[PDB]
Design a protein around this ligand. Structure first.
Ligand SMILES: [Zn+2]
Lengths: 249, 77, 96, 91, 52
RNA sequence: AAUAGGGUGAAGCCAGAGGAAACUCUGGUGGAGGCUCGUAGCGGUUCUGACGUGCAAAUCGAUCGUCGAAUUUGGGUAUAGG
RNA sequence: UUGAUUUUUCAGGCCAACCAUCGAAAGGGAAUCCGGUUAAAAUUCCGGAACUUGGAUAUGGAUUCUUCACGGCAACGUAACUGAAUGUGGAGACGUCGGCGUGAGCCCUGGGAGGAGUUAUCUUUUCUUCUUAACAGCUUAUCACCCUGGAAUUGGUUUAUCCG
RNA sequence: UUUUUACUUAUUCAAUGAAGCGGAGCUGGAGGUCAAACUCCACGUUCUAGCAUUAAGCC
């Protein structure tokens, strides 16, 4: 047969992300002396739309502690953050929406976003619109914090990892139907080349494991082993179960 | 091209060291609220600009013409 | 309760509504009290209370916004700040 | 007069996409085109830019909000939750 | 702008050709009021550094 | 970079009428839409027309689809034979 | 980058985020127009009139004895009217559609001064020339802003209901 | 020999214009002090869309 559409994406010729209009990478500040020992104050200059992103971004200006210079940061805007607001980041920052605090400095039940998986990676968890991270508890002896991720998973993170207080702005986006193929076209025009999708069952046997037949049908189980190889992993990969989800999981 | 309005400024300008030549142009105009009068334009060619002085008085033109430096080449049009 | 006291002053006493009138009344020493709405910008607020400090005038911080401050005064518009020139039948100055 | 009995703003879609999808669109699209009261200046001049961006024409304050409303219910809950937990920590 | 006189490119005020009149006015008032409160917060702090 | 001229008439807004209220009705205004008739354009339904040693190794004619967007298109650029 | 040194030596003062290079005759971008001219070239030649950039450089004006100018309440004005390192901003620099407004060119048209056509009859008639470049000065605008004043009997106001 | 967990220098991951790490000591706030000051915490920035650069001062 032929190389299937799954495998052509790794080469990344026409499958790279369309990034001309993007407004910068959304990251926290580099963890420095001020954030480790006290707090540093910045001011929100802009709240802007980032193409390909549901969450708006905030442009926050900080002073450089060591040279006469202004540093502009690109944060993910939490809902309620406004232009001209003062943003405080550090160990001694107060528990206000938009402030960046270490996870150990936040009491249980604190809603936090753009949380660091590892100390200083500048934000990994809960970055999309309407999403957040809940702080479950602390383990001060081991310097660890328990959090709940938007997927429902419980994670143990260093208490020195940082997060931004509040919920990511732009939530409720999925509640409205797109209603049109053109709307999805414009949605993916600034994301990547993944739309529209032809069904593999509608192809020929060269194109896909599902192609061929005198009727459109998969022919074999569409649940594929985790240990299958590239060109085989088309369908439900390592599916623990199938069918309509009934009851609680 | 720049227009000069002050007659005193024009004579001081015509004796600048870079002034090559001068042009005296006579236009037979009419103010439409009267009858024919003879307009005179004095044009001084400097390095960068040509300077024009419009003299609507037929007598002040003749007095001004003899007030220019005698060294200037004058073309009558 | 202060809303009732303030309403009486508007009915019987003397007042100015608006930032420009309030600052003039502080300059002239004709202000007995300055009332500032809750959503007034802090820079304008911190300047009005600097004028009152120089003018030796008490300041009352209204708990509602300029929409609620306007309707207490019987107005169909917004009042960000006001000054009481003459508390009349009311006793708002003795309570603040 | 009243021009449409029930479609309202979704009358631009004609007969397409299904009635259930159009009435679901109508609820959130009335909200995203509404004018909201500014919490800063007090005027009703707040309108959406892109999703999550709500600008006031008068005082030129931009606030981060929801996709189709200035504030979602989840954000309002977090505001009070953060406010409550802040009081205990600071006594 | 390189080939025009300076009066065309500026206004005789602080931040003349850079900021508008109202934004300069707000900077001046903010600078004065905030720095005045900095003194107040200092003398008050010294009041609690000798009795408490 | 390009895309005549019409039809329909969505929100919003103005006025009038009715009602105790919750609200309803009428006349305008407005100018929405992967709306519609229809040029340029893009396409290529039917005649199973012409031609079928052609004007043409795919064209010609009439008829037709669509025609403000998932539109059409120049140039630059990327992807290379299991 | 300076003060230099004529001692053709130097003395230092700042910096070192990023920064090889290539990539657009439709993107960005310093500056030119008119008239004429050839068998065949012209925003290129000729005539005239400008402009930009780089460099050199004197005179006038301006400024200083209150050393680095004055005026205006203000928006701001002007012939000028110190300003290193470093920093902050602006311009470059930005989709699409709808109606409205203004301008320009074109279309239409009156008088007058010319030329041509029709004219058995009719036609104060039909056609045609009557133009003004870049550039310089003065003046000229929606929007925006300033001063005054303190508004419900709410007023102003767009084709489109927004503003206080 | 097998299981577990201690070390860091091999090896691996990440960041930064390699800027403040580790330990100790100055200063306060505390424990109730039963020798004698040991232990713990902190140790210049939070109404505001301003400013912070090329050290003043003392010896
Ligand atoms: Zn506002």
């Amino acid at each position: 047969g032929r190389v299937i559409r799954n495998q052509r994406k790794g080469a990344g010729s026409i499958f790279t992300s369309h990034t001309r209009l993007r407004k910068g990478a959304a990251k926290l500040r580099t963890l420095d002396y001020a954030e480790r020992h006290g707090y540093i104050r910045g001011v929100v200059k802009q709240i802007i739309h980032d193409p390909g992103r549901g969450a708006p971004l905030a442009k926050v200006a900080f002073r450089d502690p060591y040279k006469y210079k202004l540093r502009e940061e690109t944060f993910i805007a939490n809902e309620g953050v406004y232009t001209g607001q003062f943003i405080y980041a550090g160990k001694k920052a107060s528990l206000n929406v938009g402030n960046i605090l270490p996870l150990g400095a936040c009491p249980e039940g604190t809603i936090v976003s753009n949380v660091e998986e590892k100390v200083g990676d500048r934000g990994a968890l809960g970055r999309t619109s309407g999403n957040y991270v809940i702080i479950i508890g602390h383990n001060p002896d081991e310097n660890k914090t328990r959090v709940k991720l938007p997927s429902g998973a419980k994670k143990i993170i260093s208490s020195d990892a940082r997060g931004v207080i509040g919920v990511v702005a732009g939530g409720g986006r999925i509640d409205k139907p797109l209603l049109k193929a053109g709307r999805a076209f414009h949605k993916y025009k600034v994301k990547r080349n993944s739309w529209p999708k032809t069904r593999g069952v509608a192809m020929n046997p060269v194109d896909h494991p599902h192609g061929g037949g005198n009727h459109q049908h998969i022919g074999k189980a569409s649940t594929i082993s985790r240990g299958a190889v590239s060109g085989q992993k088309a369908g439900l990969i390592a599916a623990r179960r199938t069918g309509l989800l009934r009851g609680t999981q | 091209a720049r227009e000069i309005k002050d007659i005193k400024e024009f004579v001081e300008l015509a004796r600048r060291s870079d002034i090559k030549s001068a042009i005296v142009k006579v236009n037979a105009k009419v103010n439409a609220n009267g009858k024919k009068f003879k307009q005179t334009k004095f044009k001084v060619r400097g390095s960068r600009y040509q300077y024009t002085l419009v003299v609507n008085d037929a007598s002040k033109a003749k007095k001004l013409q003899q007030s220019l430096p005698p060294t200037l080449k004058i073309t009558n049009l | 309760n202060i809303n009732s006291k303030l309403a009486l002053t508007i009915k019987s006493g003397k007042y100015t509504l608006g930032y420009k009138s309030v600052v003039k009344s502080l300059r002239t020493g004709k202000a007995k009290l300055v009332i500032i709405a809750a959503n007034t910008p802090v820079l304008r607020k911190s300047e009005l209370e600097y004028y009152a400090m120089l003018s030796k005038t008490p300041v009352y911080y209204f708990q509602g916004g300029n929409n609620e401050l306007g309707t207490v005064c019987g107005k169909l518009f917004r009042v960000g700040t006001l000054s009481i020139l003459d508390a009349g039948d009311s006793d708002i100055l003795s309570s603040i | 007069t009243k021009r449409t009995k029930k479609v309202g703003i979704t009358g631009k879609f004609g007969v397409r996409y299904g009635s259930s999808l159009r009435r679901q669109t109508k609820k959130l699209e009335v909200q995203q085109h509404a004018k909201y009261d500014c919490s800063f200046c007090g005027k009703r001049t707040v309108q959406r830019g892109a999703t999550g961006i709500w600008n006031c024409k008068s005082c030129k304050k931009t606030v981060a909000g929801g996709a189709y409303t200035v504030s979602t219910a989840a954000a309002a809950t977090v505001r009070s939750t953060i406010r409550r937990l802040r009081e205990l920590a600071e006594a | 702008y390189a080939q025009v006189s300076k009066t065309h490119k500026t206004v005789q005020r602080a931040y003349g050709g850079s900021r508008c009149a109202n934004c300069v006015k707000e900077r001046i008032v903010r600078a004065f009021l905030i720095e005045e409160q900095k003194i107040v917060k200092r003398v008050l702090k010294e009041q609690q550094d000798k009795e408490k």
